[PDB]
Amino acid sequence: CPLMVKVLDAVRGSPAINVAVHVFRKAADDTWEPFASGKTSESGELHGLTTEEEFVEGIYKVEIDTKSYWKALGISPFHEHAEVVFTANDSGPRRYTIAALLSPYSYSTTAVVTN
Amino acid sequence: CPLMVKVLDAVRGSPAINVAVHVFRKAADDTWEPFASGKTSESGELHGLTTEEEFVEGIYKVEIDTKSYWKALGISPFHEHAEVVFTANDSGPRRYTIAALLSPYSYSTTAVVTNP
Amino acid sequence: CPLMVKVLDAVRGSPAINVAVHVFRKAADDTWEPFASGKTSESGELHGLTTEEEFVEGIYKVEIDTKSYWKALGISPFHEHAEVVFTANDSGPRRYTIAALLSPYSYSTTAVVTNP
Amino acid sequence: CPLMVKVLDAVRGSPAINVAVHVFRKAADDTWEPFASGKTSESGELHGLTTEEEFVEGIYKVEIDTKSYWKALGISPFHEHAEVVFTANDSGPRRYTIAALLSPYSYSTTAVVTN
Ligand SMILES: O=C(O)c1cccc(/C=C/c2ccc(O)cc2Cl)c1
Numbered sequence: 031c032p033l034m035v036k037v038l039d040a041v042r043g044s045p046a047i048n049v050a051v052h053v054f055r056k057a058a059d060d061t062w063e064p065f066a067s068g069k070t071s072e073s074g075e076l077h078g079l080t081t082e083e084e085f086v087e088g089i090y091k092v093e094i095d096t097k098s099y100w101k102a103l104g105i106s107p108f109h110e111h112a113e114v115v116f117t118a119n120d121s122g123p124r125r126y127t128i129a130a131l132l133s134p135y136s137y138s139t140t141a142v143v144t145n
Numbered sequence: 146c147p148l149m150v151k152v153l154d155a156v157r158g159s160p161a162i163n164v165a166v167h168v169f170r171k172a173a174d175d176t177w178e179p180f181a182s183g184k185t186s187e188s189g190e191l192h193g194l195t196t197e198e199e200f201v202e203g204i205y206k207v208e209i210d211t212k213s214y215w216k217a218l219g220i221s222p223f224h225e226h227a228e229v230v231f232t233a234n235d236s237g238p239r240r241y242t243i244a245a246l247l248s249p250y251s252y253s254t255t256a257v258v259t260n261p
Numbered sequence: 262c263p264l265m266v267k268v269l270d271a272v273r274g275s276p277a278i279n280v281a282v283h284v285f286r287k288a289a290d291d292t293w294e295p296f297a298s299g300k301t302s303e304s305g306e307l308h309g310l311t312t313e314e315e316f317v318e319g320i321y322k323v324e325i326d327t328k329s330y331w332k333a334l335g336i337s338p339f340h341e342h343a344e345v346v347f348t349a350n351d352s353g354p355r356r357y358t359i360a361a362l363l364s365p366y367s368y369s370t371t372a373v374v375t376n377p
Numbered sequence: 378c379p380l381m382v383k384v385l386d387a388v389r390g391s392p393a394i395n396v397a398v399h400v401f402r403k404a405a406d407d408t409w410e411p412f413a414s415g416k417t418s419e420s421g422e423l424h425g426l427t428t429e430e431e432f433v434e435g436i437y438k439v440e441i442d443t444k445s446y447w448k449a450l451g452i453s454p455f456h457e458h459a460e461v462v463f464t465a466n467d468s469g470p471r472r473y474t475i476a477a478l479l480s481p482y483s484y485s486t487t488a489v490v491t492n
């Protein structure tokens with residue numbers, strides 16, 4: 031699992047369950063092409079988005095549909111979504127966890143990169 | 146002003162100074178049109194991006210160039226930038242502060258939305 | 262002033278108003294002595310806690326009463342309060358802003374430390 | 378595992394390894410008595426701090442020695458430590474993860490509470 035996404039809910043103190051997550055890879059024409067997507071599990075995690083072979087160096091965007099999540103809970107949210115844009119680099123560690131902590135008017139995100 | 150951006154540095158415990166910020170607005174054809182840009186001052190704040198007249202209802206994107214900021218301090222950061230995308234003014238004119246707290250592999254952003 | 266506290270609400274997208282704040286200083290006998298207290302204003306800020314003269318070198322604790330804040334909005338939060346403990350002024354007088362961003366099961370805090 | 382602590386490093390994008398963690402329980406005299414402690418693992422996690430039987434309702438403090446961590450990396454840090462104070466409550470969910478994301482002048486913490 032070279033890329034995992036984990037989403038948490040800061041309001042309810044729980045995993046953020048059934049959150050749509052779209053992953054894109056920047057193309058040569060500097061456009062965002064769909065790469066992988068899914069919905070977070072009951073533990074707020076999304077695994078097996080890609081494989082070691084397919085996840086080559088490049089710029090990736092992780093888009094988390096935060097707006098739908100809050101709407102389903104009847105909370106008026108600020109952001110259209112949360113986007114995390116980074117370069118995957120082979121030299122350094124190769125396991126990537128993108129974590130996001132969500133609130134209606136705020137989010138925080140970190141990367142945990144390990145070998 | 147109706148749109149201010151504030152950026153802080155969690156490594157140095159300081160305002161994040163000289164951070165480039167670009168604002169875009171979604172156009173009718175669904176593309177991102179450049180709307181405003183600037184750099185944060187010595188206090189980490191960016192004022193004067195727009196006016197109540199120009200800042201109409203729409204979907205806006207605030208792009209904060211965090212990677213340039215960290216690279217000039219000797220750090221190779223995780224993110225290309227920090228993006229904040231939101232609908233503005235859809236219930237009338239509001240004042241928006243977009244704040245961001247930066248670390249090399251992490252950032253946090255919040256919005257303070259007030260009614261004049 | 263040399264010590265300011267700022268508190269924001271991540272649920273409402275607003276300053277956190279009327280938040281009680283208590284400051285303590287570690288005494289020679291290793292106990293926490295009450296040093297200053299107040300409440301945040303309509304802008305989420307608490308000014309005037311102390312003076313450059315009184316704010317000597319020491320270990321300080323800023324206790325933000327987050328639980329009271331959330332309970333009066335109808336929310337049962339996780340934390341009793343948010344505590345910020347730090348050494349101050351050990352390389353000479355500085356200006357400290359302690360900022361906190363609050364959610365019911367989470368909070369984030371940072372410090373902005375400047376030299377006059 | 379009724380109580381788990383997870384610590385992340387926002388500067389290096391990694392688990393915060395070998396972080397001292399002290400857990401206290403508020404006594405009747407309103408004093409903090411040692412309850413459990415340990416050091417985070419290579420994954421930044423600290424497990425088996427307590428058991429279902431011993432972890433009764435009450436107020437607990439989790440103290441994370443952030444200052445030592447940053448000093449060992451040669452970074453001048455702001456906080457003496459990070460403290461997380463909460464009431465454990467039986468009615469609601471009974472599994473507690475206290476997570477902290479560390480920077481030299483900032484930390485963020487959240488609770489994930491599940492059944
Ligand atoms: O208005 C000000 O003068 C002011 C001063 C100090 C800190 C902050 C905000 C900090 C922050 C920003 C984004 C986050 O996601 C979390 C935090 Cl704590 C704002």
Ligand SMILES: O=C(O)c1cccc(/C=C/c2ccc(O)cc2Cl)c1
Nearest residue numbers: 129130131138140476478485486487
């Ligand atoms: O809980 C877990 O299993 C887990 C796993 C991986 C990363 C994170 C990061 C969490 C986080 C914690 C506190 C914050 O203030 C912000 C974030 Cl993103 C958490």
